[PDB]
Scaffold this active site. Structure first.
Site, mmCIF file in Angstrom:
data_model
loop_
_atom_site.group_PDB
_atom_site.id
_atom_site.type_symbol
_atom_site.label_atom_id
_atom_site.label_comp_id
_atom_site.label_asym_id
_atom_site.label_seq_id
_atom_site.Cartn_x
_atom_site.Cartn_y
_atom_site.Cartn_z
ATOM 1 N N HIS A 278 -0.259 -7.681 3.516
ATOM 2 C CA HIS A 278 0.172 -8.162 4.849
ATOM 3 C C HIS A 278 -0.665 -7.624 6.003
ATOM 4 C CE1 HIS A 278 2.819 -4.956 6.480
ATOM 5 N NE2 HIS A 278 2.793 -4.582 5.227
ATOM 6 N N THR B 141 8.247 -6.973 -13.143
ATOM 7 C CA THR B 141 7.720 -8.346 -13.187
ATOM 8 C C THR B 141 6.660 -8.524 -12.108
ATOM 9 O OG1 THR B 141 9.875 -8.981 -13.884
ATOM 10 C CG2 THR B 141 8.441 -10.765 -13.086
ATOM 11 N N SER C 263 -3.103 -3.396 0.975
ATOM 12 C CA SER C 263 -1.848 -4.054 1.442
ATOM 13 C C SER C 263 -2.102 -5.533 1.755
ATOM 14 C CB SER C 263 -1.320 -3.395 2.682
ATOM 15 O OG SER C 263 -0.249 -4.133 3.233
ATOM 16 N N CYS D 175 1.161 1.945 12.226
ATOM 17 C CA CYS D 175 0.999 0.562 11.710
ATOM 18 C C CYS D 175 2.282 -0.222 12.013
ATOM 19 C CB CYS D 175 0.632 0.511 10.222
ATOM 20 S SG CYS D 175 2.015 0.707 9.068
ATOM 21 N N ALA E 137 0.811 -1.208 0.000
ATOM 22 C CA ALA E 137 0.000 0.000 0.000
ATOM 23 C C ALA E 137 0.855 1.273 0.000
ATOM 24 C CB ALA E 137 -0.960 -0.014 1.215
ATOM 25 N N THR E 138 2.119 1.228 0.475
ATOM 26 C CA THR E 138 2.985 2.409 0.345
ATOM 27 C C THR E 138 3.119 2.809 -1.116
ATOM 28 O OG1 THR E 138 4.258 1.749 2.332
ATOM 29 C CG2 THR E 138 5.250 3.353 0.864
ATOM 30 N N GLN F 50 -6.052 -0.787 6.130
ATOM 31 C CA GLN F 50 -6.507 -1.404 7.400
ATOM 32 C C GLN F 50 -7.997 -1.737 7.371
ATOM 33 O OE1 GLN F 50 -4.720 -2.155 10.059
ATOM 34 N NE2 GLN F 50 -2.829 -1.051 9.676
HETATM 35 C C1 PLP Z 1 14.784 -8.972 -15.146
HETATM 36 C C2 PLP Z 1 15.645 -7.762 -15.386
HETATM 37 C C3 PLP Z 1 15.293 -6.542 -14.846
HETATM 38 C C4 PLP Z 1 14.032 -6.318 -14.020
HETATM 39 O O1 PLP Z 1 14.138 -6.992 -12.754
HETATM 40 P P1 PLP Z 1 12.815 -7.294 -11.825
HETATM 41 O O2 PLP Z 1 13.416 -7.812 -10.526
HETATM 42 O O3 PLP Z 1 12.015 -8.294 -12.629
HETATM 43 O O4 PLP Z 1 12.088 -5.953 -11.639
HETATM 44 C C5 PLP Z 1 16.111 -5.438 -15.056
HETATM 45 N N1 PLP Z 1 17.224 -5.543 -15.810
HETATM 46 C C6 PLP Z 1 17.550 -6.720 -16.404
HETATM 47 C C7 PLP Z 1 18.837 -6.748 -17.226
HETATM 48 C C8 PLP Z 1 16.750 -7.832 -16.216
HETATM 49 O O5 PLP Z 1 17.112 -9.004 -16.837
HETATM 50 C C1 PLP Z 2 0.543 -0.781 6.550
HETATM 51 C C2 PLP Z 2 -0.157 0.424 5.984
HETATM 52 C C3 PLP Z 2 0.316 1.026 4.836
HETATM 53 C C4 PLP Z 2 1.561 0.558 4.091
HETATM 54 O O1 PLP Z 2 1.325 -0.720 3.477
HETATM 55 P P1 PLP Z 2 2.564 -1.674 2.967
HETATM 56 O O2 PLP Z 2 1.854 -2.789 2.214
HETATM 57 O O3 PLP Z 2 3.270 -2.080 4.241
HETATM 58 O O4 PLP Z 2 3.438 -0.809 2.045
HETATM 59 C C5 PLP Z 2 -0.355 2.123 4.311
HETATM 60 N N1 PLP Z 2 -1.442 2.624 4.932
HETATM 61 C C6 PLP Z 2 -1.882 2.086 6.099
HETATM 62 C C7 PLP Z 2 -3.130 2.710 6.723
HETATM 63 C C8 PLP Z 2 -1.229 0.996 6.646
HETATM 64 O O5 PLP Z 2 -1.704 0.483 7.830
#
Ligand code: PLP
Ligand code: PLP
Ligand code: 8Q1
Ligand code: 8Q1
Ligand code: EDT
Ligand code: EDT
Lengths: 85, 126, 395, 75, 395, 126, 85, 75
Positions: free
Chosen positions: C203, C241, C201, C327, C73-74, C181
């Protein structure tokens, strides 16, 4: 034709027995409570198709419980403070 | 490449080959360009009543191009020259269930039919 | 040694076993890149990604095409706030948010103020709830976005999301809500609530860390400038990806939450009432932060006067809790909490796997250790001798 | 605390005062149990007495005395 | 039905079982937020995160403080390119990269050109390698960053990273390399190579998807403006929740690669020579794209004249491969490949788990199906009848 | 909060309490502010030879504040007033292994010692 | 004192036997080959401390193989085309 | 293809021509095996003949004829 009641009571025993083998307190206590509450909640369903759907969902969840109990045993940790006293 | 209907034209090839370009009863259509990744050669053999009695194709291109041209080659057989002129790219696409990114393959296959028919027609004027 | 009880679900949740079960095949034999178009490893991974997209959409009432996967969510909050602001910057330079939003929303807004945008940080009432009429008044001709979170991560109070949607829709201002949340906890429906963008989010809903989603409404079409450059994955909105196992876990967590939301809310409501009532009947000078009438029961923020919160957390050595937590809490300041009481607040989290025994243990230890720390406190000693702390010249 | 810990288990499981857990009582006909309750009750006897009760034996444990008798006969 | 052989490791890799084993405890009982400072779930998760940071640093010769966790090399590339450009924009507006970089580097540079930055896209030689003297000549007084990837994802060719570092260090220009296809494969040492920033992807090195890292040199200090706003995690450079299980997996993959790199390179070199030699001795008109003298053996890009690449991939129905692939190819265009031959190229990937039997099967099927597709090809028919294709007026 | 040395001063409390503020041989130091999250009260009892013979404390604050003030209270006992004046914040921090973010706790505890000693000294002038 | 040779030959047999139980072709073939190659590569180490380190690493990796073989059996899939012919 | 498939296994495992795999030959003293090889050879006999060879029996299989004799005596 299979007996829905026999499947249901066999699955209820099997799911409760397997859930009690969860090594982690929070998964074990949740699974046992949730199973008890769900079978009771669905006790008075009468539609044979809906019963069959619920039975199929339970069979799926019994597979999940079996696998996740095993995984949780392979990667177990210490008990919680309240499992002592 | 994935569709069962498309792959069938490669795994179970039919009418791949060539006809005699010097014949007055053969029309040859060669369409597309190597730099564009798709070249279709379609040849038709026409009897003395104007019925297409045989056809052959060769294609350089993706699976959908091979299937589109292969299907065109099957479909022209038994059709008169005027009938074959009404085979549409949209019928080929529908038969093969082509997605939109491969619709250009059915268009080129229709172009190949028309180039072969046009070549045959040119030969009949004398 | 023995492990502490986990009472900190607003910081993160354990994985639901049903979610880990759904993910494991993708960590073992279905390891293809969902963007590999020419082979079965890619096809099967793409299909799992699209099934997960539908599971997320079904929980919130969206079309799957409106779901973009992110790392959390960030990231979703950054895309919604910076992405809308940057897209409409030729005509609109003003955004509205609140003083109690998560740090990623507030710091995204601060970064835009350094980019030359104007941001109104609405105050909230002492309840923690915004004043809808103050929101209506703050909307300017060049306002592009209102962002207000569904459930607060520190105090658990519920903003009137549907009423804000009414206000924004009627003025053609886009409405974003950070629902991290709230998703799988309280009902969310993007059309009934008139939401244009929503952050999710994984998690916080028994899914894995490292994944989230952003809902971007397609009708009427909401436009967002993408932040992460690349090859155009996720409809050009989030290149990179798509991590198949994590998005499978997010979709599974959403489907499980859709099925368990009513059961969990009933159970967590009862445990939450038990915790609050049994602490308050046994200790004087305990105050709940946030209005209980507009509040998600799984997040309980209490102040214990005359005790500092970190020392209470240390005293509750076998319970995992948190204090002045995202959080001196800016959320407590914003609801008008006295600064000393804000140093005396603790957050208790009750979730899907919490037991009554854990609640009772936590309550019993909190009562014991608040009394102990008060017996060690010079502020409690002074009030017990009838001294008015508001009359001392400190430092 | 004889093996009529069996009565304590039955009473706890079925929400019945120890006074109403008579040796002759059927779980279903006399103590208001349904078959979800009796699955749970059998498992509770397995737990309390560290004993395994397989399906063909569980089907015969339908009264307080049948429970008492089974546990006495299995150490 | 039976599954195809996986010969597509440049798109993604399976998880090493040692990596999944290291991750599982964090998906089951060590589920704490590494940023939760007041309890053991947080402490244990933080400790696992910091151990993983040291494992990444050890593989590349860095200090752990220089390792920032990200969601992937796409994000790391955005942070390095946009982050350095934006930080030094008051004094520097020019960046240098190459025409064969991954799309995230190229599209980050395109986005900066729309922000008013100047970007030189260096050409490469027909080998795929840049001309070091052309790089030296392109550096301007206001050049802030050079970005050149270590190993190319489509053709496998190795850029002279240490020599580029010499050039950039001597001119006080920051040097970034996208090492996603090189890390744990060929030796990397940030001080010997004089690297200032480096992108790392976990799923290209037998780690999980959804995680990566960026190395940011601390001495001399490299400055980067952060892109993801939030509460200041990862030293303020990448806010958001660090996903403990994924970063544990990345660190474990780095430690395993540090131990297995020499063994894998010897094994993959032998299999790669076998594949290339046995295809070329059995088929005419097969050309390798990229110079074999500066090439990582696990990435083999060949052209099969007179056959279109997608049809060959379809024909090789039981092998997972890729064509004109980013992990009409712009990389093949940049090395001067004829457009028709670029439509005729396939990428074969050989990795840690590839067997000789898989290589031999793939070779045998490729020989069979190139011959079959040539017998179906009008271009092969024309050349077999002595026609010069370069003399036809097409369309 | 975590350090064994810090937690020990809460789990095993010593010298928590009060002395008689009206005594000419008691010095009371009250430092910090509730709004800042840390208030320390330290009292010392001095014999007629100038030796500190007892001490008590109460603290509102995090675990490191409780440990810093508790340790100060132990350390002043048996010291003369002039000796106790030389206890430094840095000695308290070293003993407790305080991290830099908690060093302000050892500074406030030193301030509490000096305020108690100053209060005692004020009382001796007559 | 434990016999390093007996530990080594017992671990070699155990690791090879367990690795042969991997359901996935690529993990099975890699683990068997890697174990054979690593023990042979380290055959002529003479330092008893270094031997002990290698033995401890092997014991750790045998735990990994056991757990990952089990996990791969719980979540197995079809064989590869070449496992037929 | 009698049970002197045993000789084929021994020859394959130890890189020795079928001609030099004589019944009297010790794996170590006569065919150049080390103890890593003999662990692998025993496992290869287990695989080929679908038989389990436990440690106290494996320790006695040190010659070609001992291998032949063991497999003949275990179906
Ligand atoms: C796969 C790849 C990326 C992107 O990496 P991700 O972890 O999939 O975001 C960037 N540069 C090269 C050369 C790659 O092969
Ligand atoms: C945990 C949380 C986030 C951030 O989410 P991530 O998936 O940890 O990046 C943003 N907003 C609220 C209200 C949260 O509790
Ligand atoms: P007994 O009194 O003779 O009979 C009892 C039954 C239920 C058999 C009787 O009342 C009956 O036949 N009712 C008909 C309706 C019916 O069969 N309901 C049950 C259908 S099955 C069901 O509801 C299963 C629900 C599954 C819950 C699993 C939760 C798992 C959680 C795990 C998480 C990791
Ligand atoms: P034999 O000829 O009587 O004796 C053979 C031995 C090796 C015992 C003899 O030569 C000897 O004693 N040598 C002394 C040195 C030594 O003991 N070397 C072996 C040390 S143990 C070792 O090297 C294990 C390495 C572990 C590799 C595991 C790879 C696992 C991969 C799994 C991935 C999922
Ligand atoms: O069925 C349940 O609800 C959980 N447990 C009991 C949970 N226990 C913890 C323990 O047994 O260690 C409760 C507790 O001790 O708090 C059943 C079982 O042990 O198989
Ligand atoms: O030891 C090995 O290298 C792998 N296998 C054999 C691998 N097989 C595949 C199979 O048995 O299905 C090789 C193949 O058939 O290609 C041993 C085992 O089966 O236990």
């Amino acid at each position: 034709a299979a007996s829905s009641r026999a499947q249901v009571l066999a699955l209820y025993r099997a799911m409760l027995r397997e859930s009690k083998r969860f090594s982690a307190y929070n998964y074990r206590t949740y699974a046992v409570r949730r199973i008890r509450d769900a079978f009771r909640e669905n006790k008075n369903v009468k539609d044979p198709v809906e019963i069959q759907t619920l039975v199929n969902k339970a069979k799926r969840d019994l597979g999940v419980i079996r696998r996740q109990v095993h995984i949780g045993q392979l990667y177990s940790t210490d008990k919680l403070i309240i499992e002592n006293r | 490449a994935y569709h069962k209907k498309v792959v069938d034209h490669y795994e179970n090839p039919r009418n791949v080959g060539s006809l005699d370009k010097t014949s007055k009863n053969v029309g040859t259509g060669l369409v597309g360009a190597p730099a564009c990744g798709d070249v279709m050669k379609l040849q038709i053999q026409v009897d003395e009543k104007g019925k297409i009695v045989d056809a052959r194709f060769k294609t350089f291109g993706c699976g959908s191009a091979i299937a589109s041209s292969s299907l065109a080659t099957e479909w022209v057989k038994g059709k008169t020259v005027e009938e074959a002129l009404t085979i549409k790219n949209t019928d080929i696409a529908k038969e093969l269930c082509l997605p939109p990114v491969k619709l250009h393959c059915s268009i080129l296959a229709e172009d190949a039919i028309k180039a072969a028919l046009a070549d045959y027609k040119l030969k009949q004027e004398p | 040694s023995l492990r502490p009880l986990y009472m900190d679900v607003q910081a993160t949740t354990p994985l639901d076993p049903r979610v880990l079960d759904a993910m494991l095949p993708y960590l073992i034999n279905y390891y293809g890149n969902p963007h590999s178009r020419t082979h079965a490893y890619g096809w099967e991974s793409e299909a799992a990604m699209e099934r997960a997209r539908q599971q997320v959409a079904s929980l919130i009432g969206a079309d799957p095409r409106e779901i973009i996967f992110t790392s959390g969510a960030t990231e979703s909050n950054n895309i919604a706030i910076k992405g809308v602001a940057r897209f409409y910057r030729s005509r609109k330079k003003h955004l509205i948010t609140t003083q109690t939003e998560h740090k990623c929303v507030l710091d995204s807004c601060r970064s835009l103020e350094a980019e030359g945008f104007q941001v109104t940080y609405l105050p909230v009432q002492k309840s923690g709830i915004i004043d809808l009429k103050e929101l209506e008044a703050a909307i300017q001709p060049d306002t592009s976005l209102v962002s207000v979170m569904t459930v607060n991560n520190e105090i658990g109070v519920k903003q009137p999301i549907a009423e804000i949607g009414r206000i924004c829709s009627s003025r053609k201002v886009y409405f974003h809500t950070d629902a991290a949340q709230a998703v799988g906890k309280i009902p969310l429906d993007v059309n009934d609530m008139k939401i244009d963008l929503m952050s999710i989010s994984g998690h916080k809903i028994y899914g894995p860390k490292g994944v989230g989603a952003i809902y971007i409404r397609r009708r009427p079409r909401v436009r967002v400038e993408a932040l992460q450059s690349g090859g155009g994955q996720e409809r050009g909105m989030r290149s990179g990806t798509v991590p198949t196992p994590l998005v499978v876990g997010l979709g599974a967590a959403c489907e499980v939450a859709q099925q368990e939301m009513e059961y969990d809310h009933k159970r967590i409501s009862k445990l939450s009432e038990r915790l609050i009532q049994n602490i308050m009947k046994s200790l004087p000078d305990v105050v709940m932060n946030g209005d209980p009438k507009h509040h998600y029961p799984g997040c309980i923020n209490l102040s214990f006067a005359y005790v500092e919160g970190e020392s209470l957390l240390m005293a509750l050595k076998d319970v995992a809790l948190s204090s002045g937590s995202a959080c001196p809490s800016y959320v407590l300041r914003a609801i008008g909490t006295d600064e000393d009481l804000a140093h005396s607040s603790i957050r208790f989290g009750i979730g899907r796997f919490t037991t009554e025994e854990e609640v009772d243990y936590t309550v019993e230890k909190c009562i014991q250790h608040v009394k102990r720390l008060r017996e060690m406190s010079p502020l409690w000693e002074m009030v017990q001798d009838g001294i008015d702390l508001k009359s001392i010249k400190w430092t | 605390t004889i093996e009529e810990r069996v009565k304590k288990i039955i009473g706890e499981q079925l929400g019945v005062k120890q006074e109403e857990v008579t040796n002759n009582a059927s779980f279903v006909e006399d103590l208001g149990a349904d078959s979800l309750d009796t699955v749970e009750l059998v498992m509770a006897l397995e737990e309390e007495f560290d004993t395994e009760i397989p399906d063909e034996e569980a089907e015969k444990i339908t009264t307080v005395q049948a429970a008492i008798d089974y546990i006495n006969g299995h150490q």
